[PDB]
A paper describes a structure:
By cryo-EM, type I filaments comprised approximately 64% and type II filaments around 36% of tau filaments. In type II [name] tau filaments, the core spans residues N269-P364 and adopts a three-lobed fold resembling that of [name] tau filaments. This fold also consists of a stem and two hairpin-like arms, but it is shorter than the [name] fold at the C-terminus. In the stem, the N-terminal segment (residues 271–281) is shifted by two residues relative to the C-terminal segment (residues 343–364), forming an interface resembling that between these segments in the P301S tau filament fold of PS19 transgenic mice. In the short arm, the opposite sides of the hairpin-like structure of type II [name] filaments have conformations resembling those of [name] tau filaments, but they are shifted relative to each other by two residues. These differences correlate with a local conformational difference around the mutation site at residue 301, the cryo-EM density of which is consistent with that of threonine. The side chain of T301 fits inside the turn formed by the glycine triplet (residues 302–304) and hydrogen bonds with S305. Compared to L301, T301 is located on the other side of the side chain of S305.
Residue numbers in the entry:
A (entry chain B), B (entry chain A), C (entry chain C): 269 to 364
Write the structure that this text describes.
Amino acid sequence: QPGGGKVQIINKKLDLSNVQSKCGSKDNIKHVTGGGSVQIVYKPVDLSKVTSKCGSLGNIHHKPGGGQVEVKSEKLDFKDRVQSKIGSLDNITHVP
Amino acid sequence: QPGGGKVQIINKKLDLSNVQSKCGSKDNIKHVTGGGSVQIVYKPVDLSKVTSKCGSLGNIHHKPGGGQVEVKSEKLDFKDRVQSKIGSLDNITHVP
Amino acid sequence: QPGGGKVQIINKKLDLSNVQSKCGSKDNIKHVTGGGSVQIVYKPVDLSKVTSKCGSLGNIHHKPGGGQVEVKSEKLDFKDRVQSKIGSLDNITHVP
């Protein structure tokens, strides 16, 4: 079985592949962005505990402040070029 | 069985593939954006506990502040070009 | 069985494929956006517990603030070009 001439031109920007075989796993692929991404996570956890045993205690003013997560983005320019220029492509096979 | 000439031109921007075989898994593919994405997660968890045993306690002013997650985006320009230019493509097979 | 000349021109922007075989899984594909996406999740969880044993306690003012998740988007321009230009394509097969 003689082979034939194979020509492959591959031009990808993002090629994310997962090949598994009997692999127990969690979440696979997530948060894929071709351009520009902005991700903000805001999970303040509060465990401020006030305990009072036998006795008295005054007033409680539990007033924490909040975060100020601010993002500016002005005059952004992300220009990508994954190209391939070929003047001439020949693929000739001779199997007499 | 002689082979034939194969020519492949592949131009993808996002190629996300998962191949599994007997793999127990969770969520597979999520949050795929070709352009630009903005993702904001806001989960403040509060466990502020006030406990009072045998005795007195004054007033309670439980007034926490809230977060200010702000995002600006002005004059954004994401220009991608995954191209392939070929002047001439020939694929000739001779199997006499 | 001699083969024939095959020519393939593939131009995709988003190619999301899942191939499984006896794989127990959860949610597969979700939140796929060709252009630009804005995703906001707002789950503040509150467990503020006030406990009072044998005794007295004053007034309770449980007034937390709310978040201000704000997003601006002005003059956005996402221009993609996944193209393929071929001047001439020939596929000739000779099996005498």
